[model samples]
Target chain A: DGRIFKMFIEHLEFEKGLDAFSQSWIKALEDSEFLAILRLLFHHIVTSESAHEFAANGIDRLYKMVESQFGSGGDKELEWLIGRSLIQMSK
Target chain B: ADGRIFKMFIEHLEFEKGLDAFSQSWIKALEDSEFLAILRLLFHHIVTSESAHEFAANGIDRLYKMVESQFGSGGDKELEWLIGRSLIQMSK
Candidate 1:
C-alpha cells in the first residue's frame, strides 16, 4: 500500500527533511506519476542506501521500515536488495 | 512538491520525449565529484526552495535509468558511486 510509502518520506525526512513529504505522498500515490515516483524511491532506498552504509543500507532500512506494516497480504519483500531493487527503479 | 515533480516529469517526457538516458545533465555532472556532492546537498534546497527538487529528481531519474541500462548493473566505481549519489541527490 502507498501508506507504507511513508518510509520513503521519513527516510527523505531524516536524510533531507522533505517538508510535508509524507502527507503529500499519501494523498498523491494513487496517481500514476506519483506512484512512479514512489516506486522509484522504493528501489532507491534498496540499492543506493544499501551500499552507502551511511543511510542504514537500503534493504534493511526498507524492511524494518515496512515490516511493521507487513499486515499479511501475500506481499513479499525482494531478497536481492539489488536485483529486485531495479524492478521499481524506473525512470 | 509531488505535484510539480509529477508535472515536470510529464513535461519532460513530452518535450524531450526522445532524450536518452545519457542525455541528462545530472548524469553529465556526475563525471565530476564536486558537482555530484553539491547535488547531494539539494535535498534541503528543495525544502527551502520550490520546483528545484521536482525538476532535479525528474532529471536524476532519467539519468539513473540511462546509466543503469548502459552499464548493465556492475560495480564500476566511478559510475556506481555516481548512480548511488545521484539517487540521494534526486531524493533530497
Candidate 2:
C-alpha cells in the first residue's frame, strides 16, 4: 500500500525539524525526480539526528520507481537501480 | 564509476551537444556510475539548484530509454551488486 509513502511524505512535509529541508519533496517524488530527494535525505540524516525517520522513503520510492519504470518489462539496468536504491536504504 | 561508459556519454556530449574539451574533461573526472550513481548525484544537483535544471533540461529521458534498451537481464546478483556499489560510491 501507500502507507510507507504516506508516512514518508508526512515526515518530510509536516515534521518539525525536517520542515527546513524544502516544501517540494512530495513533488519531487511524484515527478520521479528522486536524486534531489535522496541527496537531501542523506544530508539531513548525516547532519540531523531525526532525519532517519524518513530514510525508508528512499527504499520505498526507489522500489516503486523501478517497478513503475521496468519491473514488468524489466531490464538489467532497471533492476540495478532498484537494487542500488535498496542498498541506499539499508546504509 | 564506470569509466568506459562515462567516456561514451561524455563523448556523446562532446560530439552531439558541443561540449568543450576542458568542461568535458572536468565532467569526465566527475562522473560516477554509467547507471545509477552518476544519475542520482546529478539529479540532486539539478533538483536542489534551479539553475542546473535549466542548464540540463529534461533530455535525459530519451537517453535513459536508449540505455535501457541496451541493458540485459543476465547476472542478477552481480548486476545488483554493481548497481548498489555505484550508489554507495557516489554517496560518499
Candidate 3:
C-alpha cells in the first residue's frame, strides 16, 4: 500500500514536472491525505540538487495558501503539520 | 543582526530569566513575528546544539501546553506549527 503511494509521488515528480507536482502537493495539504507519504516527498525534494528550491519555495507558497484560507485560526493542526514539514525541509 | 538579537534573547531566557519566564512571556505577548523569531531560534537550538537542547525543549514544552489547550478555539497556529516542527526535529 505504501509503496504504491510512494510510486504515485515519484510519478508526479518525474512525469508531471514541478508545476504539476507542486500543485498536487498543495492539494495534499488541503485534503489532509497522504501526509506521511508527503514527508517522504519533502525529504526527496530537499535532497535533490535539481529540485531543492522547491523545498523552500514550496513552504513559502504553502504558508500563503494556508493563511489565506484559514487566516490565523481556522486549522491549527494543519498549520502545525506544514510547519513541521518546513522544519524537516530546512534541515 | 535580528537573528543574533533573537539568539541573545534566547540566551537571556535560558540562563538569566529561565524557561518559565520565557513561557509566560510567549503566552502573554501580542506580536506574532517577534515570538515566531524566538520559536525558530528555540527550534534551531533543539536541532543543532545538543548542549542547549534541553533548555530549548523545556521552553518549547511550556509554550506547547498553552497552545494545546487553546488549539481548537483560538490557538496560535504559527506557534503550534513551530512547536510541532521542533518536536519532529527533536525526534530525528
Candidate 4:
C-alpha cells in the first residue's frame, strides 16, 4: 500500500528532524496554491492500487502530525481537504 | 516538504495534463539545491527500498512511455537525468 510513502516520511523525519520537517510541511500547507497541489498529490498516491494496503495508516499519520503540530482544529481542516480530494479523485 | 510536494505536482501535471502544460518556471523551481536534494532522496528510496521497487519500476516505465510518445528520443533533460539516475541505482 503506502509502504513506500511511509518510508519516505520516516526518512525525511530522521534526516531533517521532526521539528524541521514539520515546519517545512506547515509552510507548504500555508500556501494555498501548494495546498491544492498537495491535496491532489495525496489523492493520487492514496488512490494508487499499490497503496491500497496501508493507505489508512498514511492518512492517519498525516492527520496526527497536523493535529500535534497545528493545535486545535488543525487536523479537521486537513481531514476535510483530504475527504474532498478523495471525492474528486472518484470522479 | 515543498520539494516533495513539488515533485508530486510536477508528476501530476505530466500524468494528467501532458507535457505541454509543464511550465519553465516549475523547472526553474527545481533548480534549488534543497528541492533537488529532497527529490534525490525520494528517488533513492524508490530505487533502493525493497518494498518500493515494484511501484518505482512501474512508475518509471509509465513516465518513460509518456516522454517517448511526447518528445521522441529527446525528452526533458532534467526528467531524463532523474529517471536515469534512479534506473542506475535500481540496477545496483
Candidate 5:
C-alpha cells in the first residue's frame, strides 16, 4: 500500500493519545486506517448482512456522513471504495 | 490508488501484462507530464507503510522503473481517458 496514510497514523500515535479510540477516529479524519476495523465491520454489516437489508439499515446514515463531512462528491467517492470490496468478494 | 488497478497496469506491460498496441500507446500517452502526474496521484493512494517508506527512499526514478516493469500498454478509445480514470479511481 502507499505510505500517504502514514502521516496521519503518525499523528495519532504520537501527537494525540494513542490509547484513545475516539481520538484515533478523529485523526483518521485530519481526513484516514480505521479501515482495518472497517474491513471487519464490512463483513458484519455488508457480508453477514445484505444489500436491501443493508439499505434498510440506513444507507442514508453512512451517505450523509460523506456528503456532509466530505461534500456532495464525497458520497459517490466513498461508494466507489465500498464497491471495490464488493466486486472483489462477489468475483 | 487501491493498487488493485495497478494490477491492470502490470497486465498491459508483459504479455503477462498487455498487448503491444496498448503498451506502445500507453507509453506514448505518458509522454505528457500531466499524464505522468495523474499516474503519480493514482499510485499515491493504496500503499502500505512499508512500501511508502521504501518509495521515499527510492523516489521518482523508482516510480518509472516500477511502472516500466509493471503497467500494461495499449491505445484507442479506452486509452484516451487513461488519466481521467485514474484520477477518478484515486479520488476515492
Candidate 6:
C-alpha cells in the first residue's frame, strides 16, 4: 500500500459540497479554474465516507456535467480521468 | 444521457471497472509501477473535463472537439444527439 497521503489526495473531490458539486464540468482551458477549485476538492477528500466511491460516482456525473456545459467538448484530462480512476478503484 | 444505448455504456463502465483496458495498468500505476503517471493523467483529465459552469454565454455548438480526445466523440452521423435528438424534441 502507498502512503495515506495519496489516498487522501485522491478523495479531494468527494464531498457533495465540494465546489458546489458542479452543474457541468466541461470547459475550455482558457475558462477553467483548477487552482481556485483545489481547496474545495482537498476538503472533500479528507472528509468523505467512501472517498473512492464518491469520486467514482462523480466521474460520470462529472462528464455529464461537462457535456451539459461545454456541449461535448469536455476538458481532455477530465474525460480520461473518470475512465481511468473508476477503472482502477473497482479493482 | 439515459437512453438505452448510453445507459449500456454507463453500466458497462461502472460494472466492468475492474476489467477495463486500463485495469491492470491502473492498479499498477496506483499501487506500484508508476503512481505519478496515474495521478498526472487523472489530474489533467479532471481539469479539462469538469462539469460546472456559472454561465454558458456561448452557444453549445462550439466546444466539443477538445473533449473527444479523452472522452470519445459523437461518431460522424449521430444527428447532434444533445442539441437535436434531445433538446429539439424537448422543445416540441
Q: Each candidate: what lDDT?
A: 0.54, 0.48, 0.63, 0.62, 0.47, 0.49
Where does the lowest 10-residue lDDT sum fall in candidate 6 chain A? A21-30
Name every residue pair that clashes in candidate 4.
A1-A51
lDDT of 5 by residue, B1-92 (tens): 23222343344344543578667867875776544643564554454234545545553344333544565332222222343345345644
User: Which scores greater on DockQ, model 3 or model 5?
Assistant: 3
CAPRI-style grade of the A/B interface in model 6: incorrect
> Worst lDDT window (10 residues) for model 5 chain B?
B72-81
Model 6 residue A50 CA deviation in Å: 5.2
Per-residue CA lDDT of model 1 for A2-83, tens digit only, reads: 7666644543334434656655644666667667766765575556433568555655666665656763331354344443
Candidates ranked by lDDT, best first? 3, 4, 1, 6, 2, 5
Query: Using TM-score as the measure, which candidate wins?
Result: 4
Better of 3 and 4 by DockQ: 3
Model 2, span B15-48: residue lDDT tens: 5445586567546655544424435444556566
Evaluated at residue A25, the lDDT of candidate 2 is 56
Tens-digit lDDT string for candidate 3 (B1-92): 55776665554333456878776665555255675676776667656645444466685577777786878435666785676686567556
Q: After superposition, how far is residue B80 of candidate 6 from its true place, in Å?
A: 57
Question: lDDT of model 4 at residue B82?
Answer: 82
Candidate scoring better on lDDT of 1 and 4: 4
Query: For candidate 5, lDDT tens digit of each residue in A25-64?
Result: 6555433233443343354555543566665645556666
Candidate 2: which stretches are off by over 4 Å?
A: A1-48, A52-91, B1-63, B72-81
Model 6, global lDDT: 0.49
Q: What is the CA-based DockQ of model 6?
A: 0.02
Q: Model 2: per-residue lDDT, tens digit, A1-91?
A: 3422332354354544555546545344543334343555576556645456457355445545766887754444555665656534433
Q: Report, for all candidates in order, the number of backbone clashes.
A: 3, 0, 0, 1, 21, 19
Model 3: DockQ vs. true structure: 0.05
